[PDB]
Amino acid sequence: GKDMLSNGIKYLDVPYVAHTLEADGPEELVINCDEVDCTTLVEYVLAETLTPKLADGDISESAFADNLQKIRYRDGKIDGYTSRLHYIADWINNGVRNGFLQDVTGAMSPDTERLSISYMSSHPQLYKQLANSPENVAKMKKIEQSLSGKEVHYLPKAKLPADGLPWIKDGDIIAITTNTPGLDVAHMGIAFYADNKLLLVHASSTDKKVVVSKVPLSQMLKDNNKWTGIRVLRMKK
Ligand SMILES: CC(=O)N[C@H]1[C@H](O[C@H]2[C@H](O[C@H](C)C(=O)O)[C@@H](NC(C)=O)[C@@H]3OC[C@H]2O3)O[C@H](CO)[C@@H](O)[C@@H]1O
Numbered sequence: 757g758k759d760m761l762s763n764g765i766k767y768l769d770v771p772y773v774a775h776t777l778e779a780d781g782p783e784e785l786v787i788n789c790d791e792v793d794c795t796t797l798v799e800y801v802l803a804e805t806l807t808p809k810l811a812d813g814d815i816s817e818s819a820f821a822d823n824l825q826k827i828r829y830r831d832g833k834i835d836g837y838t839s840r841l842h843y844i845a846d847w848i849n850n851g852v853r854n855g856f857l858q859d860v861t862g863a864m865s866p867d868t869e870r871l872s873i874s875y876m877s878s879h880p881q882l883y884k885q886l887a888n889s890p891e892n893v894a895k896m897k898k899i900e901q902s903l904s905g906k907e908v909h910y911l912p913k914a915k916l917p918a919d920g921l922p923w924i925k926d927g928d929i930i931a932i933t934t935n936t937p938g939l940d941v942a943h944m945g946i947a948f949y950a951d952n953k954l955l956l957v958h959a960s961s962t963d964k965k966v967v968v969s970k971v972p973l974s975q976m977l978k979d980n981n982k983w984t985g986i987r988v989l990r991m992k993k
């Protein structure tokens with residue numbers, strides 16, 4: 757079944773592992789579908805779903821890689837660590853610009869927030885390729901400055917009911933907005949309705965694997981004082 761939700765569900769129980777893209781050496785396309793975090797999960801699922809079926813069945817491994825590269829890197833060009841779309845605002849913009857994402861909250865929510873993005877250059881010790889690369893830090897600062905100050909639409913968490921909203925659909929990509937200083941998004945997953953509740957399929961660092969949430973997305977948001985709302989994105993084909 758070639759849809760976002762069904763391809764997400766195929767990842768249930770896959771282990772959560774941090775830093776799977778961060779091997780020593782040059783930035784190259786890393787494919788690790790057996791160990792994921794919240795972002796790489798969404799990237800693999802989107803890449804698979806974008807890839808057409810072969811006349812034989814299943815998909816071309818090179819086509820999958822090529823599509824993953826378009827999702828993960830700025831205009832699909834691999835050119836050092838800083839070419840990876842580290843910030844989700846930037847990742848969203850890349851998908852919108854290149855025609856494979858649309859911004860659903862931009863079409864449905866009257867609420868906006870102004871981006872203020874500086875986390876990585878402020879905390880370079882947290883990133884292997886920043887911790888001892890002054891050049892990469894300077895490059896990231898320019899990217900951060902380019903992103904910061906723009907307004908984006910979002911759904912404040914108080915406005916998300918347990919039963920979701922009718923314009924949020926199964927398979928939508930959910931990006932959780934955050935009050936962490938200098939950071940736009942803290943977590944991601946895939947929308948899934950069950951028992952008239954909007955749940956999230958996501959790579960859970962707490963449960964150490966990909967799960968369906970046991971409570972609605974609304975409750976996930978309410979329970980976390982750093983989480984402020986969501987952006988809702990949708991694959992476009
Ligand atoms: C800004 C940032 O940290 N970007 C990284 C991203 O973090 C994610 C991180 O979420 C983690 C994985 C989680 O919630 O378990 C979050 N980063 C921080 C600093 O909270 C944020 O939300 C999605 C994305 O940015 O991860 C990518 C894949 O490994 C990395 O390529 C990318 O560098």
Ligand code: NA
Pocket residue numbers: 872934935936937938939940
């Ligand atoms: Na923030």
